[PDB]
Design an enzyme around this catalytic site. Structure first.
Site, PDB file in Angstrom:
ATOM      1  N   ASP A  43     132.336   3.125  64.471  1.00 35.40           N
ATOM      2  CA  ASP A  43     133.732   3.324  65.817  1.00 35.40           C
ATOM      3  C   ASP A  43     133.005   1.988  66.482  1.00 35.40           C
ATOM      4  O   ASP A  43     133.652   1.662  66.999  1.00 35.40           O
ATOM      5  CB  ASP A  43     133.975   4.193  66.890  1.00 35.40           C
ATOM      6  CG  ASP A  43     132.556   4.359  66.741  1.00 35.40           C
ATOM      7  OD1 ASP A  43     131.505   3.828  66.724  1.00 35.40           O
ATOM      8  OD2 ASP A  43     132.712   5.341  68.507  1.00 35.40           O
ATOM      9  N   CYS A  46     128.206   2.682  66.391  1.00 36.81           N
ATOM     10  CA  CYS A  46     127.003   3.708  65.183  1.00 36.81           C
ATOM     11  C   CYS A  46     125.831   3.098  64.816  1.00 36.81           C
ATOM     12  O   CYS A  46     125.022   4.378  65.501  1.00 36.81           O
ATOM     13  CB  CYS A  46     127.827   3.627  64.223  1.00 36.81           C
ATOM     14  SG  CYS A  46     127.594   2.784  62.771  1.00 36.81           S
ATOM     15  N   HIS A 219     128.101   0.610  58.431  1.00 36.27           N
ATOM     16  CA  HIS A 219     127.773   2.316  59.076  1.00 36.27           C
ATOM     17  C   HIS A 219     126.028   2.178  58.748  1.00 36.27           C
ATOM     18  O   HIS A 219     125.453   1.855  57.589  1.00 36.27           O
ATOM     19  CB  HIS A 219     128.382   3.297  58.227  1.00 36.27           C
ATOM     20  CG  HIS A 219     129.517   3.793  57.886  1.00 36.27           C
ATOM     21  ND1 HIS A 219     130.767   3.161  57.471  1.00 36.27           N
ATOM     22  CD2 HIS A 219     130.341   4.344  59.405  1.00 36.27           C
ATOM     23  CE1 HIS A 219     131.331   3.191  57.493  1.00 36.27           C
ATOM     24  NE2 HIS A 219     131.542   4.242  58.781  1.00 36.27           N
TER      25      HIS A 219
HETATM   26  C1  LIG Z   1     128.069   1.202  62.739  1.00 39.03           C
HETATM   27  C2  LIG Z   1     129.497   1.104  62.454  1.00 39.03           C
HETATM   28  O1  LIG Z   1     129.876   1.196  63.936  1.00 39.03           O
HETATM   29  N1  LIG Z   1     129.935  -0.034  61.656  1.00 39.03           N
HETATM   30  C3  LIG Z   1     131.368  -0.159  62.063  1.00 39.03           C
HETATM   31  C4  LIG Z   1     132.538  -0.120  60.850  1.00 39.03           C
HETATM   32  C5  LIG Z   1     133.068  -1.606  60.568  1.00 39.03           C
HETATM   33  C6  LIG Z   1     133.638  -1.540  59.739  1.00 39.03           C
HETATM   34  C7  LIG Z   1     133.321  -0.075  59.011  1.00 39.03           C
HETATM   35 CL1  LIG Z   1     133.850   0.177  57.095  1.00 39.03          CL
HETATM   36  S1  LIG Z   1     132.115   0.372  59.376  1.00 39.03           S
END
Ligand SMILES: *CC(=O)NCc1ccc(Cl)s1
Length: 225
Positions: A43, A46, A219
């Protein structure tokens, strides 16, 4: 468990990259060094959510390390004030972070800690606190970040746009700054789709890590040795 998952076997993430040669090779290699994984929601928060949960989890049952961490957290309002944040505007975020640290001390269970990090309101207050601390730490050490990261960067604008706001993604600078701000040693494992070695970076460079994270398809997921 929509923000941070239950623990799964490392090889369970093969289903996220089906019939993929390079991802399959790297995940198999990773499974030789790590036993289990937690997935996090992608989101834009993360990194902060994964580091906050994994580091507090590593403190459970450790009475000296909890005391020392609490002592550091009690000083963080001074860091925020020195960088120009106002107490009445950070109070609600600081109080939420302090509360989850007391939960680690008083309650001491994985289940209780995981419930706080999956409560949208508590979890997002924690993340916003970590973001303000990251911003304060960079702003109070602007010459250091210009000297060692990038002499041309505009520090105040970078913090305003890429650190403070919810859902802004991280680079090396935010990871280094939050690690230093809370004295957390962490290792990031990198899994991309290039025909290259599975590799990692430790923040800071010479340390024994508390926390292992997997960075894959943007992520940060939590690893267990
Ligand atoms: C760490 C996090 O929240 N990543 C976000 C994202 C962007 C593109 C993705 Cl596929 S996950």
């Amino acid at each position: 468990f929509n923000l941070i998952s239950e623990k799964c076997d490392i090889l369970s993430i093969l289903r996220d990259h089906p019939e993929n040669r390079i991802y399959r090779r790297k995940i198999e290699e990773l499974s030789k060094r790590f036993t289990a994984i937690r997935k996090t929601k992608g989101d834009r928060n993360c990194f902060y959510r994964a580091l906050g949960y994994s580091y507090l989890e590593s403190l459970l049952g450790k009475s000296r390390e909890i005391f020392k961490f609490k002592e550091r957290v009690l000083q963080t309002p001074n860091d925020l004030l020195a960088a120009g944040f106002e107490e009445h505007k950070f109070r609600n975020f600081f109080n939420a972070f302090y509360s989850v640290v007391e939960l680690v001390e008083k309650d001491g269970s994985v289940s209780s800690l995981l419930k706080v990090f999956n409560d949208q309101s508590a979890s997002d207050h924690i993340v916003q606190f970590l973001r303000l601390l990251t911003s304060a730490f960079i702003r109070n050490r602007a010459d250091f970040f210009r000297h060692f990261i990038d002499e041309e960067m505009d520090i105040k604008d970078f913090c305003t746009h890429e650190v403070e706001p919810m859902a802004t993604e991280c680079d090396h600078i935010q990871i280094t700054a939050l690690s230093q701000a809370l004295s957390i040693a962490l290792q990031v494992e990198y899994v991309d789709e290039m025909d290259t070695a599975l590799n990692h970076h430790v923040f800071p460079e010479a340390a024994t890590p508390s926390v292992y994270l997997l960075y894959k398809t943007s992520h940060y997921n939590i690893l267990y040795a």
